[PDB]
Design a binder for this molecule. Structure first.
Ligand SMILES: OC[C@H]1O[C@@H](O[C@H]2[C@@H](OC[C@H]3O[C@@H](O[C@H]4[C@H](O)[C@@H](O)[C@H](O[C@H]5[C@H](O)[C@@H](O)[C@H](O)O[C@@H]5CO)O[C@@H]4CO[C@H]4OC[C@@H](O)[C@H](O)[C@H]4O[C@@H]4O[C@H](CO)[C@H](O)[C@H](O)[C@H]4O)[C@H](O)[C@@H](O)[C@@H]3O[C@@H]3O[C@H](CO[C@H]4OC[C@@H](O)[C@H](O)[C@H]4O)[C@@H](O)[C@H](O)[C@H]3O)OC[C@@H](O)[C@@H]2O)[C@H](O)[C@@H](O)[C@H]1O
Ligand SMILES: OC[C@H]1O[C@@H](O[C@H]2[C@@H](OC[C@H]3O[C@@H](O[C@H]4[C@H](O)[C@@H](O)[C@H](O)O[C@@H]4CO)[C@H](O)[C@@H](O)[C@@H]3O[C@@H]3O[C@H](CO[C@H]4OC[C@@H](O)[C@H](O)[C@H]4O)[C@@H](O[C@@H]4O[C@H](CO[C@H]5OC[C@@H](O)[C@H](O)[C@H]5O)[C@@H](O)[C@H](O)[C@H]4O)[C@H](O)[C@H]3O)OC[C@@H](O)[C@@H]2O)[C@H](O)[C@@H](O)[C@H]1O
Ligand SMILES: [Ca+2]
Length: 728
């Protein structure tokens, strides 16, 4: 397999779209900022454009786990150096061991060392940090807090080799929830803070503080450069230290919560300052811990480098009416929240939010007071004050990064001007994609933000499909009536019918009175070529068909849970299904299915898809089982001998001189992982991505563009929607 040069970019959703658990400023170089994602890699700030640049896109599908960024550390001695602790899950959801990634240039290129344990970039408590830290006097030294009881680890050769600090007393005892696989692991050692003043440049820093997720004993200190460790006397129990920050006046500020987050509510929190000079602990909690108004973790912690009495903390989570952002200018003696209660409804805001860079952030919804869209946020596990600009703040939310450039205006009775600061970040998990033959070039179904019509690939959409939904999980259009679409969804927050129909190419949506039998909605959807029927296969539910736009539903005969269903693109009566190792055809619009008795089939399939303009042409994407085609409606299939792995399959405009739509897949050909195109109906393939453009997990959706030769749209799991075109 040979390669052809392509240009790759994101289709713009705008504003990130997911949870970035941390932002890290460099301590010595102005405008040097990094941001870490739960499932979407890491970014470096570009001050010339005020946009973020993705750093880890070289990771191919076999290293998807390394888009899970547990911690990021930026070198204060040599700002060219940056390190990442990478690995998405501590369970068996992905097979990779964790790794420390190292760069000298500054995230442009990487090397890695694989560790003997896993990281948890997308685990509970992921906004607690930073777990990875560089010694500010001797930058050869790095420390790493780990999950799962592996304790504290250390490198003394610029992150190349790693060993356990055996003298560290406590790897952590707190576990989010032992009753489930996802939540059962020890949260562990959560942050490392060096006291720079304890040594002189060139020498290993002697005094080191370590936070541990342990309600009985959480704060540790070494005074001999990490040889021995002791709990700090007088420390509070029994909450969990999210963040610690050592200010220039010797005060170690620490935020505490009763859970690790990020989703928890009701809710206890504390904020403390430890005087590292005197050994005194002082409770500076904005809302007294004893008060029932104290109803959330304190999580985010920022300290102004230019004034150690200036500090900010955030709630995680009030959830209602909005979050709290508290500011103190007297070292926590007194605090002010960024909003106050007035005459209920009714709230007094010390801020404005400008969402012009990501207008979907208001959810297209005017709220009933005291609620207001767009919100300050939620899941605000990290807040930063620029160490070189007291007027600049940034904080994270479950959907974006917000920030301001006039922070100290608050101190003089003006409003903080908050705006989206996540331009260039695209972290959505995309579940389905269609590129219809008329209308917009792309219509998406995405996790958390539902999905969008994409009129212009380079301009972010203004609103999501259906604001009452939580995730769009499947979308299809009627091939011969391409203005007609169906969207299926999850709706965690509202009792709304979880399929919607559009008559205007996905711009406006309505819900029917009834659903296919389902527990949580979701699943997939297939629309008849002529729009006369729709098959919804909801999550953990049997395929069901409607011939009256969801007024009534009937279970499709002979199918069942897990069936993979697609419609023919020419004949509205024909639908196809792969179910329990067998292939099925319907010739009555989805009402009944019959086993075609195909003599050769893969054991299982991820996706099946019919070809526009070719009745009875059906392709099977069987992952490591390969790529298969039928041209007789699925009575016989041929396995293509020139494709190893095909996770997904899609179609775009035919190449000149060719008699078939161009075919696009992700997977593996001749021990090369990536994305591939065939212009000659699968006879020959070319690699269209390259080593620098992997984008991780690409096994949910792919489509060509029926109107633009060479263009391909690919759903990623944490890098949004990517699209490629041949280089010019
Ligand atoms: O999920 C559907 C489908 O996944 C198929 O596998 C994929 C997948 O493999 C990895 C793993 O993915 C988990 O889902 C991830 C998802 O991929 C991410 O996009 C999403 O990221 C969030 C992120 O957390 C936020 O921070 C950010 O802002 O937004 C993004 C985008 O929305 O995270 C989820 C995981 O969610 C959980 O963890 C993060 C928390 O934020 C979140 O709240 C939490 O959600 C809860 O999870 C619990 C689990 O107890 C529970 O489901 C709650 O309902 C939910 O709210 C999949 O969950 C996981 O299944 C995938 O690993 C595969 O697991 C198979 C076993 O699955 C069963 O058991 C777990 C259960 O969750 C499943 O529902 C159930 O089916 C196992 O056989 C297989 O070996 C594992 O690989 O992504 C990579 C891709 O290549 C894979 O194809 C999978 O094939 C299919 O079976 C199905 O699970
Ligand atoms: O989660 C639904 C569940 O909530 C149970 O209640 C518990 C739960 O509450 C969270 C919700 O609180 C609401 O406020 C409540 C308040 O908690 C009450 O104290 C008060 O009395 O009433 C208030 C008003 O009802 C908030 O309004 C909700 O927004 C919040 O739900 C979370 O919503 C966010 C997304 O919000 C945005 O998008 C939707 C839009 O409507 C909203 O305006 C926007 O702000 C989700 O965050 C995203 O989560 C995904 C991951 O999601 C997966 O994992 C977590 C699971 O919760 C999801 O179901 C699953 O799909 C992540 O990738 C994104 O990055 C995030 O942005 C949260 O997932 C929603 O939970 O939790 C706190 C606890 O104290 C409450 O008791 C309730 O019992 C259930 O009936 C059910 O509604
Ligand atoms: Ca931070």
């Amino acid at each position: 397999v040979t390669s052809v040069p392509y240009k790759w970019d994101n289709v713009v959703i705008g504003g990130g779209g997911g949870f970035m658990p941390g932002i890290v400023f460099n301590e010595t170089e102005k405008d040097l900022i990094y941001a870490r994602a739960a499932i979407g890699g890491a970014y470096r700030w570009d001050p010339s454009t005020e946009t973020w640049i993705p750093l880890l896109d070289h990771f191919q599908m076999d290293e998807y786990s390394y888009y899970g960024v547990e911690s990021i550390a930026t070198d204060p001695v040599d700002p060219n150096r940056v390190y990442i602790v990478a690995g998405m899950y501590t369970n068996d959801w992905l097979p990779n061991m964790g790794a420390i990634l190292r760069s000298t240039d500054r995230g442009e290129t990487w090397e890695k060392t694989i560790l003997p344990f896993k990281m948890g970039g997308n685990m509970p408590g992921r906004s607690m940090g930073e777990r990875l830290a560089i010694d500010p006097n001797d930058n050869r030294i790095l420390y790493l807090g780990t999950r799962c009881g592996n304790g504290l680890w250390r490198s003394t050769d610029y992150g190349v080799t790693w060993s356990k600090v055996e003298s560290f007393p406590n790897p952590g005892t707190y576990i989010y929830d032992p009753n489930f696989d996802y939540t059962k692991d020890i949260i562990g050692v959560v942050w490392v803070v060096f006291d720079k003043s304890s040594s002189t440049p060139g020498n290993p820093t002697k005094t080191i503080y370590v936070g541990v997720a342990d309600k009985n004993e959480s704060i540790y200190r070494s005074t001999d450069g990490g040889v021995t460790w002791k709990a700090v006397p007088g420390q509070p129990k029994g909450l969990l230290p999210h963040h610690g920050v050592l200010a220039s006046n010797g005060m170690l500020y620490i935020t505490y919560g009763d859970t690790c987050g990020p989703y928890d509510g009701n809710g206890k929190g504390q904020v403390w300052k430890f005087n590292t000079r005197t050994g005194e602990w002082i409770d500076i909690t904005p809302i007294p811990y004893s008060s029932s108004d104290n109803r959330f973790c304190f999580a985010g912690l920022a300290v102004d480098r230019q004034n150690p009495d200036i500090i900010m903390v955030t709630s995680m989570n009030a959830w209602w009416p909005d979050e709290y952002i508290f500011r103190s200018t007297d070292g926590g003696a007194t605090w002010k929240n960024i909003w106050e209660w007035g005459m209920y409804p009714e709230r007094i805001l010390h801020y404005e939010i400008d969402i012009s860079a990501a207008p979907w952030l208001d959810w297209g919804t005017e709220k009933q007071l005291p609620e207001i869209n767009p919100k300050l946020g939620w899941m605000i596990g990290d807040i930063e004050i620029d160490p070189f600009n007291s007027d600049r703040m940034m904080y994270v939310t479950g959907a974006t990064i917000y920030g301001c450039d006039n922070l100290t205006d608050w101190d003089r009775g003006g409003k903080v001007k908050i705006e989206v600061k996540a331009t260039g970040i695209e972290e959505c998990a995309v579940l389905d994609l269609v590129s219809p033959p008329e209308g917009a070039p792309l219509v998406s179904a995405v996790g958390d933000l539902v999905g969008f019509v994409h009129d212009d690939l380079k301009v972010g959409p203004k609103k999501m499909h259906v604001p009452s939904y939580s995730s769009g999980t499947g979308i299809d259009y009627a091939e011969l009536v391409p203005n007609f679409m169906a969207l299926v969804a999850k709706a965690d927050l509202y009792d709304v019918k979880k399929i919607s129909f559009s008559y205007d190419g996905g711009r406006n949506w309505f819900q029917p009175p009834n659903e296919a039998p389902n527990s949580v909605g979701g699943g997939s959807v297939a629309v008849a070529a002529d729009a006369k029927s729709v098959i919804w296969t909801p999550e953990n539910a049997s395929p069901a068909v409607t011939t009256d736009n969801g007024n009534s539903w009937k279970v499709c005969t002979n199918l069942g849970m897990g069936a993979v269903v697609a419609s023919d693109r020419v004949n509205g009566k024909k639908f196809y299904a792969f179910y329990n190792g067998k292939f099925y055809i319907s010739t009555d619009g989805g009402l009944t299915f019959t086993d075609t008795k195909a003599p050769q089939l893969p054991k299982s399939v991820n996706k099946i898809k019919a070809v526009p303009g070719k009745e009875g042409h059906v392709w099977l994407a069987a992952r490591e089982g390969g790529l298969w085609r039928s041209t007789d409606g699925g009575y016989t299939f041929e396995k293509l001998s020139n494709v190893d792995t095909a996770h997904v399959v899609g179609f775009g405009k035919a190449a000149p001189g060719q008699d078939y739509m161009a075919i696009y897949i992700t997977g593996k050909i001749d021990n090369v992982l990536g994305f591939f195109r065939s212009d000659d109906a699968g006879k020959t393939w070319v690699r269209i991505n390259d080593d620098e453009h992997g984008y991780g997990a690409v096994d949910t959706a792919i489509t060509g563009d029926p109107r633009v030769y060479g263009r391909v749209y690919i759903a990623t799991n944490g890098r949004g929607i990517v699209y490629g075109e041949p280089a010019s």
